[PDB]
Enzyme design. Structure first.
Site, PDB file in Angstrom:
ATOM      1  N   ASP B  65       0.882  -1.179   0.000  1.00  0.00           N
ATOM      2  CA  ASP B  65       0.000   0.000   0.000  1.00  0.00           C
ATOM      3  C   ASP B  65       0.926   1.237   0.000  1.00  0.00           C
ATOM      4  O   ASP B  65       1.595   1.469   1.021  1.00  0.00           O
ATOM      5  CB  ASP B  65      -0.832   0.014   1.303  1.00  0.00           C
ATOM      6  CG  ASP B  65      -1.789   1.207   1.315  1.00  0.00           C
ATOM      7  OD1 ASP B  65      -1.661   2.133   0.498  1.00  0.00           O
ATOM      8  OD2 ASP B  65      -2.631   1.281   2.253  1.00  0.00           O
ATOM      9  N   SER B 142       1.085  10.113 -17.721  1.00  0.00           N
ATOM     10  CA  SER B 142      -0.195  10.386 -18.343  1.00  0.00           C
ATOM     11  C   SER B 142      -0.136  11.655 -19.179  1.00  0.00           C
ATOM     12  O   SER B 142       0.557  12.622 -18.853  1.00  0.00           O
ATOM     13  CB  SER B 142      -1.134  10.671 -17.112  1.00  0.00           C
ATOM     14  OG  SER B 142      -2.390  11.119 -17.607  1.00  0.00           O
ATOM     15  N   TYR B 155      -6.350  15.952 -10.274  1.00  0.00           N
ATOM     16  CA  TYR B 155      -5.734  14.800 -10.926  1.00  0.00           C
ATOM     17  C   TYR B 155      -4.550  15.292 -11.798  1.00  0.00           C
ATOM     18  O   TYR B 155      -3.442  14.766 -11.682  1.00  0.00           O
ATOM     19  CB  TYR B 155      -6.776  14.185 -11.893  1.00  0.00           C
ATOM     20  CG  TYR B 155      -6.153  13.078 -12.740  1.00  0.00           C
ATOM     21  CD1 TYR B 155      -5.686  11.917 -12.147  1.00  0.00           C
ATOM     22  CD2 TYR B 155      -5.999  13.268 -14.115  1.00  0.00           C
ATOM     23  CE1 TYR B 155      -5.112  10.924 -12.915  1.00  0.00           C
ATOM     24  CE2 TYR B 155      -5.430  12.253 -14.882  1.00  0.00           C
ATOM     25  CZ  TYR B 155      -4.979  11.112 -14.262  1.00  0.00           C
ATOM     26  OH  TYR B 155      -4.401  10.125 -15.035  1.00  0.00           O
ATOM     27  N   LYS B 159      -0.497  14.571 -11.578  1.00  0.00           N
ATOM     28  CA  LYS B 159       0.258  13.945 -12.666  1.00  0.00           C
ATOM     29  C   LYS B 159       1.390  14.904 -13.120  1.00  0.00           C
ATOM     30  O   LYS B 159       2.550  14.503 -13.345  1.00  0.00           O
ATOM     31  CB  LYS B 159      -0.698  13.614 -13.823  1.00  0.00           C
ATOM     32  CG  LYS B 159      -1.715  12.491 -13.514  1.00  0.00           C
ATOM     33  CD  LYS B 159      -0.987  11.369 -12.803  1.00  0.00           C
ATOM     34  CE  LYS B 159      -1.684  10.089 -12.560  1.00  0.00           C
ATOM     35  NZ  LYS B 159      -0.789   9.029 -12.027  1.00  0.00           N
TER      36      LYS B 159
HETATM   37  N1  LIG Z   1      -6.602   4.568 -17.068  1.00  0.00           N
HETATM   38  C1  LIG Z   1      -6.323   5.599 -17.887  1.00  0.00           C
HETATM   39  O1  LIG Z   1      -7.133   5.915 -18.736  1.00  0.00           O
HETATM   40  C2  LIG Z   1      -4.966   6.258 -17.603  1.00  0.00           C
HETATM   41  C3  LIG Z   1      -4.473   7.310 -18.378  1.00  0.00           C
HETATM   42  C4  LIG Z   1      -3.217   7.859 -18.103  1.00  0.00           C
HETATM   43  C5  LIG Z   1      -2.440   7.419 -17.013  1.00  0.00           C
HETATM   44  N2  LIG Z   1      -2.937   6.367 -16.221  1.00  0.00           N
HETATM   45  C6  LIG Z   1      -2.134   5.905 -15.066  1.00  0.00           C
HETATM   46  O2  LIG Z   1      -1.969   4.472 -15.079  1.00  0.00           O
HETATM   47  C7  LIG Z   1      -1.661   4.025 -13.742  1.00  0.00           C
HETATM   48  C8  LIG Z   1      -2.314   2.664 -13.578  1.00  0.00           C
HETATM   49  O3  LIG Z   1      -3.736   2.818 -13.479  1.00  0.00           O
HETATM   50  P1  LIG Z   1      -4.804   2.063 -14.428  1.00  0.00           P
HETATM   51  O4  LIG Z   1      -5.102   2.991 -15.583  1.00  0.00           O
HETATM   52  O5  LIG Z   1      -4.338   0.727 -14.753  1.00  0.00           O
HETATM   53  O6  LIG Z   1      -6.090   1.998 -13.431  1.00  0.00           O
HETATM   54  P2  LIG Z   1      -6.600   0.789 -12.490  1.00  0.00           P
HETATM   55  O7  LIG Z   1      -6.962  -0.361 -13.365  1.00  0.00           O
HETATM   56  O8  LIG Z   1      -7.596   1.301 -11.516  1.00  0.00           O
HETATM   57  O9  LIG Z   1      -5.221   0.318 -11.782  1.00  0.00           O
HETATM   58  C9  LIG Z   1      -4.537   1.124 -10.804  1.00  0.00           C
HETATM   59  C10 LIG Z   1      -3.959   0.239  -9.725  1.00  0.00           C
HETATM   60  O10 LIG Z   1      -3.443   1.118  -8.690  1.00  0.00           O
HETATM   61  C11 LIG Z   1      -3.760   0.511  -7.459  1.00  0.00           C
HETATM   62  N3  LIG Z   1      -3.691   1.365  -6.280  1.00  0.00           N
HETATM   63  C12 LIG Z   1      -4.572   2.312  -5.929  1.00  0.00           C
HETATM   64  N4  LIG Z   1      -4.270   2.768  -4.720  1.00  0.00           N
HETATM   65  C13 LIG Z   1      -3.183   2.137  -4.313  1.00  0.00           C
HETATM   66  C14 LIG Z   1      -2.422   2.190  -3.133  1.00  0.00           C
HETATM   67  N5  LIG Z   1      -2.826   3.043  -2.170  1.00  0.00           N
HETATM   68  N6  LIG Z   1      -1.365   1.363  -3.008  1.00  0.00           N
HETATM   69  C15 LIG Z   1      -1.047   0.510  -3.959  1.00  0.00           C
HETATM   70  N7  LIG Z   1      -1.732   0.420  -5.110  1.00  0.00           N
HETATM   71  C16 LIG Z   1      -2.805   1.219  -5.286  1.00  0.00           C
HETATM   72  C17 LIG Z   1      -5.167  -0.102  -7.675  1.00  0.00           C
HETATM   73  O11 LIG Z   1      -5.445  -1.103  -6.680  1.00  0.00           O
HETATM   74  P3  LIG Z   1      -6.779  -1.228  -6.162  1.00  0.00           P
HETATM   75  O12 LIG Z   1      -7.598  -1.759  -7.204  1.00  0.00           O
HETATM   76  O13 LIG Z   1      -6.881  -2.105  -5.027  1.00  0.00           O
HETATM   77  O14 LIG Z   1      -7.329   0.032  -5.735  1.00  0.00           O
HETATM   78  C18 LIG Z   1      -4.925  -0.752  -9.042  1.00  0.00           C
HETATM   79  O15 LIG Z   1      -4.238  -2.015  -8.833  1.00  0.00           O
HETATM   80  C19 LIG Z   1      -2.007   5.172 -12.793  1.00  0.00           C
HETATM   81  O16 LIG Z   1      -0.852   5.757 -12.139  1.00  0.00           O
HETATM   82  C20 LIG Z   1      -2.561   6.237 -13.701  1.00  0.00           C
HETATM   83  O17 LIG Z   1      -3.184   7.293 -13.126  1.00  0.00           O
HETATM   84  C21 LIG Z   1      -4.180   5.785 -16.544  1.00  0.00           C
HETATM   85  C1  LIG Z   2      -5.518  12.416 -18.508  1.00  0.00           C
HETATM   86  C2  LIG Z   2      -6.348  11.307 -19.160  1.00  0.00           C
HETATM   87  C3  LIG Z   2      -5.712  10.873 -20.480  1.00  0.00           C
HETATM   88  C4  LIG Z   2      -6.020  11.886 -21.605  1.00  0.00           C
HETATM   89  C5  LIG Z   2      -7.481  12.215 -21.787  1.00  0.00           C
HETATM   90  C6  LIG Z   2      -7.788  13.240 -22.853  1.00  0.00           C
HETATM   91  C7  LIG Z   2      -6.897  13.604 -23.856  1.00  0.00           C
HETATM   92  C8  LIG Z   2      -7.224  14.525 -24.844  1.00  0.00           C
HETATM   93  C9  LIG Z   2      -8.454  15.114 -24.862  1.00  0.00           C
HETATM   94  O1  LIG Z   2      -8.788  16.037 -25.839  1.00  0.00           O
HETATM   95  C10 LIG Z   2      -9.390  14.792 -23.877  1.00  0.00           C
HETATM   96  C11 LIG Z   2      -9.060  13.856 -22.885  1.00  0.00           C
HETATM   97  C12 LIG Z   2     -10.104  13.545 -21.844  1.00  0.00           C
HETATM   98  C13 LIG Z   2      -9.728  12.575 -20.741  1.00  0.00           C
HETATM   99  C14 LIG Z   2      -8.227  12.501 -20.464  1.00  0.00           C
HETATM  100  C15 LIG Z   2      -7.840  11.592 -19.364  1.00  0.00           C
HETATM  101  C16 LIG Z   2      -8.395  11.669 -17.944  1.00  0.00           C
HETATM  102  C17 LIG Z   2      -7.704  10.438 -17.273  1.00  0.00           C
HETATM  103  C18 LIG Z   2      -6.423  10.203 -18.091  1.00  0.00           C
HETATM  104  O2  LIG Z   2      -5.279  10.145 -17.227  1.00  0.00           O
END
Ligand SMILES: NC(=O)c1ccc[n+]([C@@H]2O[C@H](COP(=O)([O-])OP(=O)(O)OC[C@H]3O[C@@H](n4cnc5c(N)ncnc54)[C@H](OP(=O)(O)O)[C@@H]3O)[C@@H](O)[C@H]2O)c1
Ligand SMILES: C[C@]12CC[C@@H]3c4ccc(O)cc4CC[C@H]3[C@@H]1CC[C@@H]2O
Ligand SMILES: NC(=O)c1ccc[n+]([C@@H]2O[C@H](COP(=O)([O-])OP(=O)(O)OC[C@H]3O[C@@H](n4cnc5c(N)ncnc54)[C@H](OP(=O)(O)O)[C@@H]3O)[C@@H](O)[C@H]2O)c1
Ligand SMILES: C[C@]12CC[C@@H]3c4ccc(O)cc4CC[C@H]3[C@@H]1CC[C@@H]2O
EC number: 1.1.1.51
Lengths: 285, 285
Positions: B65, B142, B155, B159
């Site tokens: 965690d 991101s 958020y 990031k």
């Molecule tokens: N998803 C998108 O569209 C997007 C876009 C750009 C960047 N990202 C980035 O990608 C990364 C991975 O996220 P994801 O997109 O794969 O979403 P996700 O499927 O919700 O996975 C994120 C993971 O982080 C874990 N986590 C949350 N709180 C935590 C804590 N306190 N300690 C340890 N682990 C924890 C979650 O575990 P739990 O399930 O138990 O909570 C889950 O395993 C993030 O840093 C993020 O913001 C995602």
């Molecule tokens: C920043 C994110 C990736 C880029 C995404 C994007 C990127 C370009 C755009 O015109 C709109 C959006 C909306 C949602 C955005 C997202 C919110 C969660 C994710 O991390």
């Protein structure tokens, strides 16, 4: 007077000079609420204000601690006009040293003041500007929020965070007629640094000998960058007034053109390595 | 096997697919410690791992965690090899809605997990890589850390903060032979968003009617951006492996070339207004 300006962190530096530069303005059109974390430190503000001849009533001081939303709301309630035309989010803290030598309190404080503090200011004051369909928000920025600096990991983390925070708000705000701008500053003579740290004895205890040595080198180097590039807070205040004057304020204003080439090399090489190599050479040799 | 990889946030999405993509690698050269906030949610990880045929011992799960430094140190102690060759900081949370509708806990959590959590990971694991003179740190990035998005104020704040944090560390690290890279991702099909929020009833209570309406518009628009641009976590995992393979890893790797033009308009217009005008038109019309 007519434009109501509320400024955070006015006991010294940017905030202090901006409050008095506005309240001593020739047009006498600004009514300034100069806010401070601790009212008892207001001495230097008045000394400068009296050296500039600010008309009685042009400047009022309030206590406003950005870590406390009750202090923030209490200050809002003391704006007698019931409105804020220009909100200046300036309060900020530094944090210096090897990442592994930083304690949890210090890291948390920096984020709480620099980031969450701005969020508190914006949650308390944006609603009324949106209701009125008008308002200017000016945020003290830093080149540290646009490019990373060694041994300022959490500080840069916090300054980049304001960039993200204000850019995201700026996209929403146009249609509400509320303008948000960042005033990007380099090193400024303000005692910001004077409290940014010391204590080599304790630091050596928290990191390895090589990191420690690289830290001393960064410290030698920032002693020269400060003498080479610090600006005076009066010069920075003029950039805020430039922003508050423009009928259509841009998102960013730069107080120096000095770091732009460096800034441009983070973009013209998107992998971001050109910057990393160039900053390592400028700092460590 | 030989390269020891420790990954955060592996119950789903990027982390989950990256752990299994590494442990099921043809060369069988990776020993993966897939860490999760709550071990009881490891079901989906194994289902995928067993669909890919990961050799016994290639993958081990631990509880980690990121909000708790005792959990982080306990996990480090379970690395039997006594070393970590590739540290992947992936855990992350979203936060969506009008700035004024966000509560103090939610804001604080986001910063604590996304920012301070990474700092904890780095303080626990950087020392040994510096001692050894080698190591790779890969951070899930991101496009939200490179450009502001309306209603993602905190958020994006978080990031952008990682951008500042990792760039600052990268300048120090070259001479230690430890590489740090960010993997810049757009929207990813991962359920990250599925928990990013809902509850219009409560939100309308916390903001004005116009902001609320603009929020609904942002929500309509991100429903299309997600269908238009989400990538699958398998594609994103391949970008991490590209980074961990390069003998001289760059600071940034992009999983899509899709948002670059938008990114370029924040630089080619340094006032940053071209971006603000263009993002408002893409989102709200
Ligand atoms: N998803 C998108 O569209 C997007 C876009 C750009 C960047 N990202 C980035 O990608 C990364 C991975 O996220 P994801 O997109 O794969 O979403 P996700 O499927 O919700 O996975 C994120 C993971 O982080 C874990 N986590 C949350 N709180 C935590 C804590 N306190 N300690 C340890 N682990 C924890 C979650 O575990 P739990 O399930 O138990 O909570 C889950 O395993 C993030 O840093 C993020 O913001 C995602
Ligand atoms: C920043 C994110 C990736 C880029 C995404 C994007 C990127 C370009 C755009 O015109 C709109 C959006 C909306 C949602 C955005 C997202 C919110 C969660 C994710 O991390
Ligand atoms: N100084 C530089 O070289 C430089 C470079 C780039 C950007 N900046 C930025 O400029 C801004 C102004 O700082 P400065 O350079 O003028 O330094 P400074 O002289 O130390 O002034 C900062 C002010 O912020 C106040 N402050 C601190 N904590 C606060 C809190 N919890 N609530 C309310 N106010 C608080 C300080 O009050 P107290 O004295 O009581 O603590 C002081 O009045 C900061 O946001 C910042 O980081 C500075
Ligand atoms: C980011 C800061 C402004 C820009 C400064 C800079 C800018 C360029 C450079 O090559 C070195 C430094 C060292 C100290 C930096 C500063 C630390 C505090 C200040 O906010």
């Amino acid at each position: 007077a007519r434009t109501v300006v509320l400024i955070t962190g006015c006991s010294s530096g940017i905030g202090l000079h901006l409050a008095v530069r506005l309240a001593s303005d020739p047009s006498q059109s600004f009514k300034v609420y100069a806010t401070l974390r601790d009212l008892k430190t207001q001495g230097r503000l008045w000394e400068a204000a009296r050296a500039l001849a600010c008309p009685p009533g042009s400047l009022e001081t309030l206590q406003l601690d950005v870590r406390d939303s009750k202090s923030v709301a209490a200050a809002r309630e003391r704006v007698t006009e019931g409105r804020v035309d220009v909100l200046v989010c300036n309060a900020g803290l530094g944090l210096l040293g090897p990442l592994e030598a930083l304690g949890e309190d210090a890291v948390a404080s920096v984020l709480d003041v620099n980031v969450v503090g701005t969020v508190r200011m914006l949650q308390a004051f944006l609603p009324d500007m949106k209701r009125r369909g008008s308002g200017r928000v000016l945020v003290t920025g830093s080149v540290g929020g646009l490019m990373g600096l060694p041994f300022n990991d959490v500080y840069c983390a916090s300054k980049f965070a304001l960039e993200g925070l204000c850019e995201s708000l700026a996209v929403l705000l146009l249609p509400f007629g509320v303008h948000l701008s960042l005033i990007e500053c380099g090193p400024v003579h303000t005692a910001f640094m004077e409290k940014v740290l010391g204590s080599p004895e304790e630091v050596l205890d928290r990191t390895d000998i090589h990191t420690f040595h690289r830290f001393y080198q960064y410290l030698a180097h920032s002693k020269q960058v400060f003498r080479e590039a610090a600006q005076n807070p009066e010069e920075v205040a003029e950039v805020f007034l430039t922003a508050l004057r423009a009928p259509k304020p841009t998102l960013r204003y730069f107080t120096t053109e000095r770091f732009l080439p460096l800034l441009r090399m983070r973009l013209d090489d998107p992998s971001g390595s050109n910057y990393v190599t160039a900053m390592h050479r400028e700092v460590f040799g």
